[PDB]
A paper describes a structure:
Coronaviruses are enveloped viruses possessing large, trimeric spike glycoproteins (S) required for the recognition of host receptors for many coronaviruses as well as the fusion of viral and host cell membranes for viral entry into cells. The S1 subunit is responsible for host-receptor binding while the S2 subunit contains the membrane-fusion machinery. SARS-CoV makes use of its S1 RBD to bind to the human angiotensin-converting enzyme 2 (ACE2) as its host receptor. Here, we have used single-particle cryo-EM to determine structures of prefusion stabilized SARS-CoV S 2P ectodomain in uncleaved, S1/S2 cleaved and ACE2-bound states.
To examine the structural consequences binding ACE2 to the stabilized SARS-CoV S 2P, we combined SARS-CoV S 2P ectodomain with an excess of soluble human ACE2 with subsequent purification by size-exclusion chromatography and immediate cryo-EM specimen preparation. Initial sorting of particle heterogeneity indicated spikes could be split into ACE2-bound (45%) and unbound (55%) classes. As hypothesized by previous structural work, the S1 RBD of the stabilized spike recognizes ACE2 with an ‘up’ S1 RBD conformation. Despite prolonged co-incubation and an excess of ACE2, we had difficulties in saturating the S1 RBD with ACE2 in the context of stabilized trimeric S ectodomain. The reduced binding of ACE2 to trimeric spikes is likely due to the incomplete exposure and conformational flexibility of the S1 RBD. The ACE2-bound, S1 RBD extends upwards and rotates away from contacts with nearby amino acids. Hence, any conformational changes induced by receptor binding to the S1 RBD are more likely to be caused by the absence of the S1 RBD contacts in the ‘up’ conformation, rather than the formation of additional intra-spike contacts in a receptor-bound state. However, fine examination of the ACE2-bound S structure revealed a modest conformational change in the S2 central helix where the S2 had been uncapped by a receptor-bound RBD. However, in the ACE2-bound structure, the upper portion of the S2 helix uncapped by the ACE2-bound S1 RBD has transitioned to a 310-helix. The α- to 310-helix transition is unique to the S2 protomer uncapped by the ACE2-bound S1 RBD and is not observed in the other two copies of the trimeric spike.
Residue numbers in the entry:
A (entry chain A): 306 to 318, 515 to 663, 672 to 694
B (entry chain B): 695 to 809, 818 to 823, 831 to 1127
C (entry chain C): 841 to 937
D (entry chain C): 695 to 742
E (entry chain C): 986 to 1034
Write the structure that this text describes.
């Protein structure tokens, strides 16, 4: 998850300013929680004050202070999978940050608001964005092979000699071709 | 009763192969930005470990299912240029290189007739309840690539196409063996070639115009998406269950009343959701067992109907099986059972036995009927009267043993040598 | 409570009696398509060269076969007459629920 | 070895098909003519 | 009641696999001469009922 750094408390005419695009611990008027703030475009009415999901979750807000439409989002979360070529092969790993924006993970890692973190860890300048999520610790070659370690969306990970951990698009097989005729057999 | 003529039908079959994989976070489901939720969670074991790996384990076996269906060939055969072989017009079945979408026109129907939770689309987004759908491994064009490769290689070899490395054979000759497989002489194909090709290419368009307008033949697929969305909606509905506590709002109980009061109230609430999450897991788990059992049937049909002629009746659809064809679809496949169906029956009078000079002459194969003038031999699949010689009829034992013997003669080619 | 099924046993017997009656007339296109008509012995003879026996063995030994046919049926009939000892599977499903 | 005579067996097989379908009412099971049973299950969704 | 329904549900799906075998044994075993071994009973199958 991502540590909520920031607090926005507002009331109509104590009050604080408007943080956007940061996981903050907001407190609107009778509206609490954490999340990331951003402006909205939802067509309110003069008596609307805050919207909801079709589930039991408020998703948008109207400012008590300045009467502006903002939609709220949950902060950031997801799971972590660990990639390894085997302790017998090597000793370096790579991680997948499952279903999360690589624009934001790169932001939060330099500010170091990621839980859990580690002692000895760095980026390595190999941030690739998969459809399955954020890959850190592998270089993107453009060749094709069989799928050793699948991650998703046809992308598989492997450990070739270049030796390092590589990510690529799968080889479906050899593109054979054979003729057709009406005499040949 | 013997049929004289026939028809050729293309019977359809839709079988689902794969369930949409899910995952659920604990803390973004049961806690909701509550530190004391996690502080109370530590007295409930590391349940999130097996709750993750159960759904991940069945997520992995979904991709086990798909490659158990498709990943069988070793050579990606290229789409041939000509799409019209011996009067048989396959052009709407292969994907179009002229308008590259890597789908057939038939498949483009299927990606339309089938037409909350976290999901990524290329922008990812996640909702509040810590649950999402992981995307499948094999993307659809990749699946459509295996789809196009097998049907292409189907029309060129067949058996060595199923026995590993394929071969080349003329497509009409491979048709005639399938007639020879069900006991039809190969001339019958050769002497009815335009009529069959008419009956083939009309029946595709008759099928093509059938499923185009209306629907619910595909109902075996959309229910799958309809059932588990209800299962997802079931879990989301359960958030308003108060379980005998104050309310389903943790923050009120955090704000109104004392923590020694609250930590039996939210404790009553946490055990409500945690028990509720187990029920979702178990029904999700047992359902994955059923579709995987259905997938093993589908993978069996892929190798026993497409890569070879079968013989078991009412398998591969009704009628005498001739040739099968796969079609890709979301979470499933569609088979095309090109089958043989005879027609035009008549009445004829039998002859089990033939009395000629006190001996019993029984046919090597076929039976004997009186057409009205004399006696003839034919096969059971098709009315082809032929001449009665020793070439198709052995002798064993004398006459006057069995029931129903006929006084008639046997032609022998020894006679005109005199 | 128990809901009643959609079909009665008599309706199930209606399919059962029809197919058994329809077994003795066509056989293969009986289910593959439209029905046909064949004498029963000729239909029996296809089973022999189906498994690799010439049709004389039927046509010679027809009395012995038919007497092996009907008499073993009555032996099956008296097998499921005295004591059950066989239909425990249908007793199991009633015992389960 | 080549057989000469034969025998025509009649082998049976018995397969189950249909489990007896059931149904059940909640208030005739959990409540039993009570009111506050039905009046307090409102915090439990629609389980029935 | 909840654990009844799930435990009712498993044996529901259990016999449905058994009914599929019956659906196989209704068509393939009766409507035509099968050739596969020890299916349709023991011995060389001729006729089913
Ligand atoms: C093999 O079968 C395929 C069909 O699977 C067949 O290809 C078809 O050819 C016809 C014409 O030869 C195509 O019909 C036209 O398609 C275009 C675009 O799809 C339409 O715009 C056309 O509409 C015009 O013409 C209509 C008829 O007069 C008018 O009513 C209309 O207003 C337009 O002016 C017309 O529908 C058809 O699309 C293709 N189908 C495919 C899938 O490509 C092919 O000819 C067959 N070949 C052999 C060798 O058997
Ligand atoms: C392969 O085995 C079959 C077994 O079915 C066999 O067919 C049998 O052939 C014998 C030849 O003797 C038949 O036996 C006699 O048949 C007459 C016909 O009516 C009966 O009346 C006789 O009954 C007398 O003997 C019985 C036994 O002692 C007494 O109980 C009775 O009161 C009579 O005294 C006698 O059984 C026999 O009937 C057939 N079987 C059938 C079912 O018809 C066949 O011959 C064998 N093949 C070879 C090559 O040996
Ligand atoms: C049952 O089988 C019978 C098999 O013989 C059928 O009889 C045959 O029916 C066909 C109909 O297609 C006739 O075939 C035609 O015959 C004419 C005339 O042939 C005569 O002329 C030539 C030339 O002068 C001469 O050389 C011949 O010897 C004939 O005398 C042909 O010109 C046509 O091309 C065509 O082949 C047969 O002639 C006829 N055979 C006999 C012996 O009658 C019968 O119709 C069948 N019945 C049913 C109900 O199916
Ligand atoms: C609640 O009260 C606050 C003030 O305490 C209001 O904020 C005020 O909003 C107006 C319009 O958004 C601002 O007016 C603008 O001022 C600039 C410079 O003075 C002028 O050039 C513009 O033409 C415009 O009129 C005003 O500055 C701002 N005041 C402060 C202190 O920020 C707020 O609008 C009130 N809430 C509602 C719903 O009205
Ligand atoms: C992660 O979040 C960032 C937002 O911080 C997303 O970046 C946004 O990406 C979209 C396209 O994917 C950009 O939209 C484009 O904008 C230009 C001009 O602004 C317009 O001409 C294009 O037609 C298109 O609409 C957007 O500018 C960009 N915003 C920022 C701040 O970078 C990103 O897509 C998210 N990634 C995932 C995987 O969710
Ligand atoms: C076996 O059955 C097939 C299927 O019915 C028969 O082929 C069809 O025969 C009919 C007449 O017997 C043909 O209809 C005619 O079509 C032409 C052209 O459209 C039209 O001008 C006529 O007025 C009439 O409607 C039909 O075209 C034909 N179909 C094909 C694909 O050839 C066949 O004759 C039967 N053969 C035997 C030996 O029983
Ligand atoms: C089919 O053809 C066979 C042979 O051409 C016919 O069988 C013959 O039936 C006659 C009865 O009229 C038998 O004749 C008898 O022969 C003995 C010999 O001494 C004589 O003493 C009797 O007074 C009587 O004439 C003849 O033996 C018999 N031949 C054979 C080879 O079995 C048969 O009848 C024909 N089928 C039909 C339905 O007519
Ligand atoms: C049999 O003939 C086929 C075509 O008639 C041959 O296939 C071609 O083989 C050559 C090399 O031998 C390749 O360069 C071509 O690309 C092949 N054709 C296609 C369409 O791919 C095949 O090799 C021949 N085999 C033998 C044993 O003679
Ligand atoms: C590791 O792999 C090497 C070959 O690369 C092999 O010889 C060795 O037995 C393996 N050892 C272990 C512990 O897996
Ligand atoms: C065959 O004969 C039956 C009566 O035995 C009759 O009902 C039927 O219509 C006949 N069919 C043909 C095609 O001759």
């Amino acid at each position: 998850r991502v540590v909520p750094s920031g607090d926005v408390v507002r009331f109509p005419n104590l009050s604080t300013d408007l943080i956007k695009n940061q996981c903050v611990n907001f407190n609107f008027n009778g509206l609490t929680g954490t999340g990331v703030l951003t402006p909205s475009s939802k067509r309110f009415q003069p008596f609307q004050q805050f919207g909801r999901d079709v589930s039991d979750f408020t998703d948008s807000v109207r400012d008590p202070k300045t009467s502006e439409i903002l939609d709220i989002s949950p902060c950031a979360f997801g799971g972590v999978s660990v990639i390894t070529p085997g302790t017998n092969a090597s000793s370096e790993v790579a991680v997948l940050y499952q279903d999360v924006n690589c624009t934001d993970v790169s932001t939060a890692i330099h500010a170091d608001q990621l839980t859990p973190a580690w002692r000895i860890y760095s980026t390595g300048n190999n941030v690739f964005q998969t459809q399955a999520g954020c890959l850190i610790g592998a270089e993107h070659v453009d060749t094709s092979y069989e799928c050793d370690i699948p991650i998703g969306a046809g992308i598989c990970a492997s450990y070739h000699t270049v030796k390092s951990i590589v990510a690529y698009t799968m080889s479906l097989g050899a593109d054979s071709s054979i003729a057709y005729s009406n005499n040949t057999i | 009763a013997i049929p004289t003529n026939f028809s050729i039908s293309i019977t359809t079959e839709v079988m689902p192969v794969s369930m949409a994989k899910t995952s659920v976070d604990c803390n973004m489901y049961i806690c909701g930005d509550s530190t004391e939720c996690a502080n109370l969670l530590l007295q409930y074991g590391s349940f999130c470990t097996q709750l993750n790996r159960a759904l991940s384990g069945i997520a992995a076996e979904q991709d086990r299912n798909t490659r158990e269906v498709f990943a069988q060939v070793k050579q990606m055969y290229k789409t041939p240029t000509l799409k019209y072989f011996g009067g048989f017009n396959f052009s709407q079945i292969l994907p179009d290189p002229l308008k590259p979408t890597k789908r057939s026109f038939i498949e483009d129907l299927l990606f339309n007739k089938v037409t909350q939770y976290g999901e990524c689309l290329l922008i990812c987004a996640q909702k509040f309840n810590g649950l999402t759908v992981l995307p499948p491994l094999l993307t659809d064009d990749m699946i459509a690539a295996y789809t196009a490769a097998l049907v292409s290689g189907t029309a060129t070899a067949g058996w060595t196409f199923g026995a590993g490395a394929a071969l080349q054979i003329p497509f009409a000759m491979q048709m005639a063996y399938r007639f020879n497989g069900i006991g039809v002489t190969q001339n019958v194909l050769y002497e009815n070639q335009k009529q069959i090709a008419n009956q083939f290419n009309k029946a595709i368009s008759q099928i093509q115009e059938s499923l185009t307008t209306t629907s619910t033949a595909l109902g075996k697929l959309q229910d799958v998406v309809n059932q588990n969305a209800q299962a997802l909606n079931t879990l989301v509905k359960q958030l308003s269950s108060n379980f005998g506590a104050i309310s389903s709002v943790l923050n009120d109980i955090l704000s109104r009343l004392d923590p020694p009061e609250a930590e039996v109230q939210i404790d009553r609430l946490i055990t409500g959701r945690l028990q509720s999450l187990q029920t979702y897991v178990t029904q999700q788990l047992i359902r994955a067992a059923e579709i995987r059992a259905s997938a093993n049937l589908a993978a069996t049909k892929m190798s026993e109907c497409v890569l070879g002629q079968s013989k078991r009746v009412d398998f591969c659809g009704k009628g005498y099986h001739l040739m099968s064809f796969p079609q890709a679809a979301p979470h499933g496949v569609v088979f095309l059972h090109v089958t043989y169906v005879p027609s035009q029956e008549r009445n004829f009078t039998t002859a089990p036995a033939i009395c000629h000079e006190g001996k019993a002459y029984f046919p090597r194969e076929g039976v004997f009927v009186f057409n009205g003038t004399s006696w003839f031999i034919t096969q059971r699949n098709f009315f082809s009267p032929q001449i009665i010689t020793t070439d198709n009829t052995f002798v064993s034992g004398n006459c006057d043993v069995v029931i129903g013997i006929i006084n008639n003669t046997v032609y022998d080619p020894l006679q005109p040598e005199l």
